[PDB]
Structures are given as C-alpha cells and as structure tokens.
Scaffold this active site. Structure first.
Site, PDB file in Angstrom:
ATOM      1  N   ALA A 192     -11.995 -24.004  12.685  1.00 26.90           N
ATOM      2  CA  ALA A 192     -10.842 -23.335  13.073  1.00 26.90           C
ATOM      3  C   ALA A 192      -9.396 -24.152  12.961  1.00 26.90           C
ATOM      4  O   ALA A 192      -8.703 -24.330  13.848  1.00 26.90           O
ATOM      5  CB  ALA A 192     -10.821 -22.905  14.778  1.00 26.90           C
ATOM      6  N   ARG A 193      -9.422 -24.733  11.776  1.00 28.66           N
ATOM      7  CA  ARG A 193      -8.196 -25.446  11.455  1.00 28.66           C
ATOM      8  C   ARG A 193      -7.499 -24.849  10.018  1.00 28.66           C
ATOM      9  O   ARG A 193      -6.846 -25.509   9.581  1.00 28.66           O
ATOM     10  CB  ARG A 193      -8.677 -26.929  11.192  1.00 28.66           C
ATOM     11  N   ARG A 242     -28.326 -28.961   6.767  1.00 26.52           N
ATOM     12  CA  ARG A 242     -26.789 -28.925   6.268  1.00 26.52           C
ATOM     13  C   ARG A 242     -26.490 -29.810   5.169  1.00 26.52           C
ATOM     14  O   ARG A 242     -25.980 -29.562   4.299  1.00 26.52           O
ATOM     15  CB  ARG A 242     -26.035 -29.180   7.530  1.00 26.52           C
ATOM     16  N   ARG A 273     -20.498 -38.369   5.212  1.00 30.19           N
ATOM     17  CA  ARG A 273     -20.581 -37.206   4.270  1.00 30.19           C
ATOM     18  C   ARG A 273     -19.522 -37.388   3.237  1.00 30.19           C
ATOM     19  O   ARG A 273     -19.665 -37.107   1.900  1.00 30.19           O
ATOM     20  CB  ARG A 273     -20.506 -36.101   5.268  1.00 30.19           C
ATOM     21  N   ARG A 332      10.522  -0.943  -4.432  1.00 28.78           N
ATOM     22  CA  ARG A 332      11.553  -0.981  -5.717  1.00 28.78           C
ATOM     23  C   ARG A 332      13.007  -0.438  -5.186  1.00 28.78           C
ATOM     24  O   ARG A 332      12.743   0.142  -4.175  1.00 28.78           O
ATOM     25  CB  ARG A 332      11.140   0.034  -6.764  1.00 28.78           C
ATOM     26  N   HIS A 333      13.923  -0.642  -5.915  1.00 33.85           N
ATOM     27  CA  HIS A 333      15.143   0.107  -5.779  1.00 33.85           C
ATOM     28  C   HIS A 333      14.866   1.581  -5.595  1.00 33.85           C
ATOM     29  O   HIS A 333      13.999   1.925  -6.217  1.00 33.85           O
ATOM     30  CB  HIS A 333      16.196  -0.069  -6.833  1.00 33.85           C
ATOM     31  N   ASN A 338      16.506   5.776 -14.504  1.00 31.62           N
ATOM     32  CA  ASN A 338      15.029   6.065 -14.348  1.00 31.62           C
ATOM     33  C   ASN A 338      14.927   7.670 -14.653  1.00 31.62           C
ATOM     34  O   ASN A 338      14.057   8.174 -15.249  1.00 31.62           O
ATOM     35  CB  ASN A 338      14.524   6.178 -12.887  1.00 31.62           C
ATOM     36  N   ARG A 382      21.214  -1.297  -8.616  1.00 31.23           N
ATOM     37  CA  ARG A 382      20.351  -0.482  -8.004  1.00 31.23           C
ATOM     38  C   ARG A 382      19.613  -1.173  -6.818  1.00 31.23           C
ATOM     39  O   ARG A 382      19.352  -0.107  -5.981  1.00 31.23           O
ATOM     40  CB  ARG A 382      19.405   0.174  -8.995  1.00 31.23           C
ATOM     41  N   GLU A 387      15.254  -7.317 -13.087  1.00 29.04           N
ATOM     42  CA  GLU A 387      14.150  -6.909 -13.897  1.00 29.04           C
ATOM     43  C   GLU A 387      14.145  -7.567 -15.104  1.00 29.04           C
ATOM     44  O   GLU A 387      14.858  -8.164 -15.682  1.00 29.04           O
ATOM     45  CB  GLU A 387      14.517  -5.196 -14.042  1.00 29.04           C
ATOM     46  N   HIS A 428      11.853  -4.444  -8.904  1.00 27.80           N
ATOM     47  CA  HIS A 428      11.822  -3.554  -9.950  1.00 27.80           C
ATOM     48  C   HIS A 428      10.392  -3.257 -10.251  1.00 27.80           C
ATOM     49  O   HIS A 428       9.650  -4.232  -9.975  1.00 27.80           O
ATOM     50  CB  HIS A 428      12.673  -4.216 -11.202  1.00 27.80           C
ATOM     51  N   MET A 472       7.838  -6.461  -9.325  1.00 26.84           N
ATOM     52  CA  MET A 472       6.866  -6.304  -8.322  1.00 26.84           C
ATOM     53  C   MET A 472       5.496  -6.266  -8.729  1.00 26.84           C
ATOM     54  O   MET A 472       4.683  -6.747  -8.177  1.00 26.84           O
ATOM     55  CB  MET A 472       7.407  -4.853  -7.695  1.00 26.84           C
TER      56      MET A 472
HETATM   57  N1  LIG Z   1     -16.912 -15.721   3.344  1.00 27.65           N
HETATM   58  C1  LIG Z   1     -15.692 -15.148   3.699  1.00 27.65           C
HETATM   59  N2  LIG Z   1     -15.337 -13.941   3.579  1.00 27.65           N
HETATM   60  C2  LIG Z   1     -14.364 -13.202   4.150  1.00 27.65           C
HETATM   61  N3  LIG Z   1     -13.703 -14.005   5.161  1.00 27.65           N
HETATM   62  C3  LIG Z   1     -13.635 -15.198   5.425  1.00 27.65           C
HETATM   63  C4  LIG Z   1     -14.937 -15.909   4.759  1.00 27.65           C
HETATM   64  N4  LIG Z   1     -15.284 -17.088   5.202  1.00 27.65           N
HETATM   65  C5  LIG Z   1     -14.212 -17.393   5.992  1.00 27.65           C
HETATM   66  N5  LIG Z   1     -13.419 -16.356   6.309  1.00 27.65           N
HETATM   67  C6  LIG Z   1     -12.167 -15.933   6.889  1.00 27.65           C
HETATM   68  O1  LIG Z   1     -11.674 -17.487   7.189  1.00 27.65           O
HETATM   69  C7  LIG Z   1     -11.144 -17.350   8.458  1.00 27.65           C
HETATM   70  C8  LIG Z   1     -11.993 -18.628   9.566  1.00 27.65           C
HETATM   71  O2  LIG Z   1     -13.211 -18.317   9.416  1.00 27.65           O
HETATM   72  P1  LIG Z   1     -13.954 -19.419   8.905  1.00 27.65           P
HETATM   73  O3  LIG Z   1     -15.283 -18.612   9.227  1.00 27.65           O
HETATM   74  O4  LIG Z   1     -13.488 -20.001   7.642  1.00 27.65           O
HETATM   75  O5  LIG Z   1     -14.375 -20.261  10.308  1.00 27.65           O
HETATM   76  P2  LIG Z   1     -13.762 -21.848  10.333  1.00 27.65           P
HETATM   77  O6  LIG Z   1     -14.490 -22.423   9.316  1.00 27.65           O
HETATM   78  O7  LIG Z   1     -14.186 -22.235  11.881  1.00 27.65           O
HETATM   79  O8  LIG Z   1     -12.317 -21.914  10.390  1.00 27.65           O
HETATM   80  P3  LIG Z   1     -11.196 -22.604   9.275  1.00 27.65           P
HETATM   81  O9  LIG Z   1     -11.822 -22.327   7.801  1.00 27.65           O
HETATM   82  O10 LIG Z   1      -9.699 -21.887   9.549  1.00 27.65           O
HETATM   83  O11 LIG Z   1     -11.185 -23.988   9.338  1.00 27.65           O
HETATM   84  C9  LIG Z   1     -11.182 -16.020   9.068  1.00 27.65           C
HETATM   85  O12 LIG Z   1     -10.045 -15.282   9.089  1.00 27.65           O
HETATM   86  C10 LIG Z   1     -12.539 -15.244   8.379  1.00 27.65           C
HETATM   87  O13 LIG Z   1     -12.712 -14.198   8.307  1.00 27.65           O
HETATM   88  O1  LIG Z   2       6.418  -3.105 -18.794  1.00 21.92           O
HETATM   89  P1  LIG Z   2       7.052  -1.689 -18.540  1.00 21.92           P
HETATM   90  O2  LIG Z   2       5.666  -0.885 -18.172  1.00 21.92           O
HETATM   91  O3  LIG Z   2       7.539  -1.348 -19.930  1.00 21.92           O
HETATM   92  O4  LIG Z   2       7.799  -1.625 -16.950  1.00 21.92           O
HETATM   93  C1  LIG Z   2       9.048  -2.377 -16.930  1.00 21.92           C
HETATM   94  C2  LIG Z   2      10.281  -1.400 -17.355  1.00 21.92           C
HETATM   95  O5  LIG Z   2      10.214  -0.369 -16.213  1.00 21.92           O
HETATM   96  C3  LIG Z   2      11.470  -0.181 -15.720  1.00 21.92           C
HETATM   97  O6  LIG Z   2      11.732  -0.941 -14.363  1.00 21.92           O
HETATM   98  C4  LIG Z   2      11.506   1.359 -15.256  1.00 21.92           C
HETATM   99  O7  LIG Z   2      11.676   1.999 -16.247  1.00 21.92           O
HETATM  100  C5  LIG Z   2      12.250  -0.707 -16.554  1.00 21.92           C
HETATM  101  O8  LIG Z   2      13.618  -0.993 -16.162  1.00 21.92           O
HETATM  102  C6  LIG Z   2      11.555  -2.010 -17.350  1.00 21.92           C
HETATM  103  O9  LIG Z   2      11.938  -2.263 -18.630  1.00 21.92           O
END
Ligand SMILES: Nc1ncnc2c1ncn2[C@@H]1O[C@H](COP(=O)(O)OP(=O)(O)OP(=O)(O)O)[C@@H](O)[C@H]1O
Ligand SMILES: O=P(O)(O)OC[C@H]1O[C@](O)(CO)[C@@H](O)[C@@H]1O
Ligand SMILES: Nc1ncnc2c1ncn2[C@@H]1O[C@H](COP(=O)(O)OP(=O)(O)OP(=O)(O)O)[C@@H](O)[C@H]1O
Ligand SMILES: O=P(O)(O)OC[C@H]1O[C@](O)(CO)[C@@H](O)[C@@H]1O
Lengths: 425, 420
Positions: free
Chosen positions: A18-19, A72, A106, A226-227, A233, A276, A296, A361, A365
C-alpha cells in the site's frame, strides 16, 4: 574493450504494501515507452498468485513461514529469468520489477543477478509515513486490489493490516549513509512530497527521476475536449485560426453548465493560443491559461485547405500521409511525432494535477488521449474525439477510466478514417 | 504567489563560499535558455563589488559588521529590483539569483519579494561536506575568483578561509523537516553525489532537478573534432555515407598520436554511425562507442548534392535556407533545430563527463559548440569547425576555455558563409 556503457537497466521497486508501488511502476513504464525506450513491468503479485493458485491470508507473509518464504523466493527467481529474457532476447531496454523487496537479502539477490548479466540497477523506494497518505493507499487496496477475492471484501481490511505488520518486522529501508551509499536509487517519500536521490549514474536515470518528480499517485480526474465547432470545421478546412460557429458558441455555453453541475474543486482551464479554444473558455466565467504548445498541428502549405483540395493539389503527399500518418510531415509543417514532442510539458503537468480541463484540438487531443490511455503511435492519429464531447479521465494503476459526455449541441464530423480495402497492400 | 501554471520563476542559490554556486547558476541558466526558456543570472558578487568599488577582506563579511551588512542588504534589494524588471518588463521567464543566502532572514526577504510579485521560488542549496570537494573548490576560488585582485594572490587563501568562517557562524541550512517543509527546493550534496528534493511544484522545477542530476562541477576537459576528410568532402557533396579520403585517414593517424601525447585518463571516444567517423575512431587503437544521434544533419532530397547543384535544381529552397538557416528544414530532412533536439542525450552526457572525444560532423559539431560555448541560434549554423582541427574545451563558471589544435594534415574547406 569496451564495457558497460550500452547495458539495459533494471528498475527495482521497494516498499511496504500500500505504498503506490504498482501505480508508480505502471505509469513510469508507460512514460518510458512514450519517449521511445522499450520497457516492460514485471508484477510479482501476479507471479505469486498464479503460483499458489489461491488468495492468501496474512500468515502466508510471515518472514518465519519457511514454506511460504521458499515459494516467494522462487517466484522472484522466475520473474528475474523473465526479465533476462526480455532484456536480452526480446529487445527490451528497461525492465521494471514491481515487488516489496524490503529485505537486504532479497535486494542482494537482485543485485547479484544484475551483475552476472551486466544490467544496470536503479532502485525506486516508496516510503510513506504520512497517516493520511497511508490510510488512503490502504483503502484503495481494500476496495480494488486483485490480491483479494473480487467479492466479499468485508474481512480484507483486517487481514491486510496484519499482512503489513508482517513486512514491517524485517523491513530494512535503503540506507544512504552506510549500507547502500554506493547504490543508485531514489526514495519517493509520501508519494512525492519529497525525494532522496543517490548516485544518479547516467542520462536515463536522470529521466527516471525527472518523471517521478511529476507523478501523482492519489486518484485524480482530468477533462479533455475540443474547442466548440469552428467556421473552418463547417467548411471542412484544416488548420487556420477561425472563430467559433454559432453552434460552437452554444457548445461553450453548454460546457459552462456542465462544469457547474460537475462541482469541480479548484478547476483549472487550459486552452491553446488559437481563437477557437480561447472563445470556448471565455464563456465559462472562470480564469483560464493559454498555451502555445496546445496549438493544433501545423499543416504547412496545406493550412486552410480541405482534404479534397489537398488530394487534388498534392496527390502524392496525400497518399503518403495515409500510408504513414504518424511520421508524415506536412511540407512546411508538422508530423504527429513533432506534436508529441512539443506536448511533453503539458503531459507532465497533467500527470501531476487533477481538476484540469484542457480545451484543445483534434490532433492535440489524440496525443493526450494516447498518452493517458496507453495507445501506440499506430493508433494515435486515428483516435476518435468528436466536437462537443467531453472526455472525463480517471487514471488507475492498470489503465484509465474514461467517461464520454456528449453535450446537446450538434457539430460536423471532422474524423477521416484511414482508407480501407484497397489493392495492392 | 503562483496563481498560474506558467508564471515566472526565481531560482535562489544557497550556500557557503566555494560551493560551486556560481558555476551551477551559470550552467543551469545556459541550459534553460538552450531549451527555449529565457533565463538570466544575477551575480550578487558583481553587484556588491560594483557598489563598494574595492576588493574586500574577510572583515566585510562578518555578520556583526553593521555597516557592511547594510550595504550587502541594499545590493540584494537592487538585484531583486532588476529581477522584477527582467521578469515583468523584459519578457524573462526565469531569474537565477546567485548569492550565499545562508540566513533565514535573507531568504524570508526574497520570499516576500516573490510573493508581492507573484513569482514562484525554487531554492538550490549547495551543501559540501566532503573534504576533497571543499578543498578543490577553495583552490579554484584562490586561483581564479574575481573577488580578489588579479595579480599577487599570495594572501588570498588565508583571507578566504576566514571569510568562510564568517559565514559558518550564521549559516542556517534548509530544514525540510520543520522550518522549510513547505518550501520548494533541492539540496545538491557534494556537487551531485546525492540530492534532497522537496515540494517540486511544476514541470519547470522538475526540469531544473533533471539538469542538476547531469551537471558536473569539478573541472573537466572534452575534445571535439570532425571525421577526417571524406571522399564527399573532396567532391563538395553534402550528406551521404562516404569513407575517409587518404588525407582523412592520415588525420586519424595524427589524431592517435595527439591523444597519446595528451596523456588522457579513461578516454572515451564517441562517434556517429556513419563510416567516416567510425573509420576515424578505428585508427585510434582504443574502444569507441557509436551514437545514432550524432549522425550528420539529414539533407533529405538534397543528400549527396553539391551546393551548386542544389542552387540549380532548387533555387527557391536554397535561397530560403540562406535566409533562415537555423529553422529551415530540408524537404524530407532536418533543420538545425531538429538536430539540437535529438542531441540532448549526448549533451547531457557531456555535461556529466570529462575525458571524452566526440568525433562527429560539421552541423552536429556546430550544435555541440553552440551549447558549451553559449552561442545563440542565429550564430549556431555558422560556427567554424574546420576538418582536421581539434577543439579542446574546459568549461568554467563564466564560459569555456577553448584551445584549437590544427593537426598537420591538410583538408578541403567545407564552410559556406552566408551571402552578403
Ligand atoms: N494486476 C493488476 N490488475 C489491475 N490492477 C492492479 C493489479 N495489480 C495491482 N493493481 C492495482 O494497484 C493498486 C494497489 O494494489 P496492489 O494489489 O498493487 O496492492 P499493494 O502492492 O499492497 O499496493 P502498492 O502497489 O500501492 O504498493 C490497486 O489500485 C490495484 O487495483
Ligand atoms: O490528422 P488529421 O486527421 O488530419 O486531424 C487534424 C486536423 O483536424 C482539425 O483539428 C479539424 O479538421 C484540423 O485543424 C487539423 O489539421
Ligand atoms: N564575474 C565573474 N566572471 C568570471 N568568472 C567568475 C565570476 N564570478 C565568479 N566566477 C567564477 O566562479 C568560480 C567561483 O568563484 P566565485 O567568485 O564565485 O567564488 P564563491 O562565490 O566563493 O564560490 P562558488 O560560487 O563556487 O560558491 C571561479 O572559477 C570564478 O572565476
Ligand atoms: O549546414 P551546412 O553549412 O550546409 O553544413 C552541413 C553540411 O556539412 C557537411 O558535414 C560537410 O559538407 C555535410 O555533410 C552537411 O550537409
């Protein structure tokens, strides 16, 4: 003639349960892959659960339990053999070993493994002594950790608290002043309130530390959209600096209402420097910050053209971009790879913070989604982010919760699919 | 205050004299400017020397010298006003305040200035307790510090040691456990053996920490040269992957003899992956490492052409590149800006290490010289680095000692001046 300059690196997690170790391991692994360094995580929880084929109560984790300790240890050795295979047979460059590793015996076993194989070693020790951080992490384990049964967690907390005490008995933290003065490591204290860094040996260790200075472990939520719909557009024109259409202005008003309803504490709003996105934020009634690096993608000589005009005027360039959309660079402009590179400061600030809305954009995004949703460069330029839809993201150790919210204002579709079904290729 | 994510930042050095503060300030400032963040250093030594109009004995630095303390405080206040102007009127983004700042009262004055102006503050405290590190830093002050007269330094050491004692009397280090638990800072311990980092608040603070994990303060020497003359150099052809001319091979043999004479401990030799740099290193008789990111700038569709051919075939592109040589991108190739960006990992390793010879290429080497000699992007693409000449670089706090050594093997000239 020569020696160890070209070695791969084994990053070794240390800490009590839990760290935040598994979250840190996974997000660090994603970041390293993002900057082009092949990296894989090895989760010893998975190894040991698969080995014992059942959930284990706290007595399994007593340092006295000779039978458990032997199981372990064998799991650690199996994972190390997988590490070796990854780094020497599968073209990996960094392996991340996610386990407690709280005893010196370990750690010495791991160090001897690394020396035999000429792997560099860097330790990441997560030390939490703040009661609020601890209580939060423990609650997260109780609710979501797969180291306990999916349903009926009523007794998890009491057991897990006792399991932690088992580890406390033999935990030796890294000792920078004596026993471990020559090891390369970082102690991450209270999930990043502060850090102790010892003997950083090389560029990649500096990048690891850099990343960990930006990580945020506690649950957080970020919003991306996006805007609002722009005039260009509506015209099908890419690039440029056109303003909002009347529907984009309606979206901006609806966005304000949505943000009010979400009741977001300390909301920050980031836009680009293009009209935009600015116009979208101006309607929200809250301060916002413009970022040049959120502008963009630059389409060079194709700025302000439609795809049909581009295919007509530059048929060879148009086909090239369809073949290699991530790496293709517009003449006089950018590729998605260029865009990824200039976005790194925004990405680091979004690793760090929650309660941020980024108004950007389509191409921008896509890059941000690819980073936070762990998508590869192949898929990145085709990720779908419609106008007038909010993406609400809550990162977790193994991925990211995504909710989409379509606001009630229509917009054109600007998503062009990769051409399909053509012959030859 | 810190109300915006990208508000300006005041980096505040802390430490006793002879702690590398002034080196760290200058090299960090150069790095921040290199990655595009306008940054300026404010050296309080200069402010105070200019104000008091003389060199000062240790007596000036007594915490109980009331008249001196008032002058020193006024200099700090003047420098802070220049910081304010830089960050609010001159479009600066980061100010680096190089002073001792060893008392809580001075640090509180700086913090209040920052809060009044909504500047973020990040402290860099250099803590040296290793006797070897200290003794080295002190001798460097003794030899070169401009805080003493240029000539006749025979009494400098004795005075400077007493000056350090003056500061030890009132030195309060940053206390992360209590008094300074809410401040943002890094303690650099023994010029980078280890670090204590507290409350990194943003991306740029993480980059400052990143840089300091790669810096090396003690004097070091690195060597830069190009591959020996290539066949394409003799033909005037840019780019490509041609091998050494016979003169380039003769240079490589001369380079081995030169390196032997330099009596270099633990020499590392780094090349690109192109044949001409590899063949140059292969004549040296020592291990060498190839780096893809040291490959020459990619000229795209102009690869393997002469400038005359490029001008004939692509006159418009040729003229654009002359107008904007740093930013111009070859069609299908690179700009110098692309080259700068991919060189960052080797620049960081050259910040960290000494006794490195880098055998590279004209444009690559221009970038490396621009970094270690603090040249701007305007000048970077026109820096002169002749074939068969070695640049021997010893970075110092205010620049870099540069020795050029022309080995006795002629080579063609590949340097094209900007047209007039
Ligand atoms: N194999 C996995 N798949 C999905 N989520 C996981 C997995 N292993 C750990 N997690 C996520 O990591 C977080 C901590 O759980 P873990 O089981 O890693 O406990 P822990 O080892 O005691 O804590 P920490 O890793 O934070 O020190 C939880 O949000 C848990 O869902
Ligand atoms: O890489 P793509 O798929 O051409 O998308 C980026 C383009 O999309 C837009 O954000 C919207 O058409 C443009 O301004 C930009 O050039
Ligand atoms: N104004 C300057 N011009 C040129 N070099 C300088 C200047 N100021 C400091 N330096 C260089 O910085 C190094 C340290 O000298 P300085 O005068 O800063 O002593 P200090 O402040 O006691 O030491 P440190 O800055 O390392 O804590 C020397 O190599 C010195 O020449
Ligand atoms: O930017 P410039 O001045 O054209 O110099 C870079 C050129 O110099 C060379 O290293 C030698 O001619 C070429 O390979 C390269 O294209």
């Amino acid at each position: 003639a020569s020696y160890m300059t070209n070695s791969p690196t084994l990053i070794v997690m240390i800490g009590l349960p839990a760290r935040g170790k598994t979250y840190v391991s996974k997000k660090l692994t994603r970041y390293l892959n993002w900057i082009g360094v092949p990296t894989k995580v090895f989760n010893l929880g998975v190894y040991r659960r698969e080995a014992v084929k059942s959930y284990k109560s706290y007595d399994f984790f007593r340092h006295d339990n000779e039978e458990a300790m032997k199981i372990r240890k064998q799991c650690a050795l199996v994972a190390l053999e997988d590490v070796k295979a990854y780094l020497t047979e599968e073209n990996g460059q960094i392996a991340v070993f996610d386990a407690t590793n709280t005893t010196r015996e370990r750690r010495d076993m791991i160090l001897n493994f690394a020396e035999q194989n000429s792997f560099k070693v860097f330790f990441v020790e997560s030390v939490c002594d703040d009661p609020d951080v601890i209580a939060a992490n423990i609650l997260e384990v109780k609710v979501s950790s797969p180291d306990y049964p999916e349903r009926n967690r009523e007794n998890v907390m009491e057991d897990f608290l006792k399991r932690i005490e088992c580890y406390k008995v033999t935990y030796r933290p890294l000792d920078p002043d004596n026993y471990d003065k020559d090891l390369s490591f970082i102690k991450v204290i209270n999930v990043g309130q502060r850090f102790l860094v010892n003997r950083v040996q090389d560029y990649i260790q500096s990048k690891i530390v850099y990343y960990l200075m930006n990580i945020h472990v506690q649950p957080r939520t970020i919003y991306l959209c996006r805007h609002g719909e722009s005039e260009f557009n509506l015209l099908g024109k890419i690039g440029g600096d056109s303003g909002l259409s009347v529907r984009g202005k309606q979206f901006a008003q609806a966005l304000r209402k949505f943000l009010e309803e979400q009741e977001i504490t300390d909301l920050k709003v980031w836009t680009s420097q293009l009209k935009r996105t600015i116009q979208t934020a101006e309607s929200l009634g809250v301060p916002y910050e413009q970022w040049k690096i959120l502008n963009e993608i630059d389409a060079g000589v194709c700025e302000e053209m439609t795809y049909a005009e581009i295919e007509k005027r530059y048929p060879e360039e148009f086909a090239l971009r369809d073949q290699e959309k991530y790496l293709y660079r517009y003449p006089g402009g950018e590729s998605y790879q260029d865009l990824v590179q200039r976005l790194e400061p925004v990405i680091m600030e979004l690793e760090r913070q929650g309660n941020v809305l980024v108004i950007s954009h389509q191409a921008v995004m896509r890059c941000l989604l690819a980073y936070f949703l762990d998508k590869g460069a192949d898929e990145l330029p085709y990720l779908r982010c419609p106008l007038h839809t909010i993406f609400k993201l809550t990162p977790v150790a193994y991925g990211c919760k995504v909710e989409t919210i379509k606001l009630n204002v229509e917009a054109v579709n600007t998503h062009r699919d990769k051409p399909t079904n053509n012959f030859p290729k």
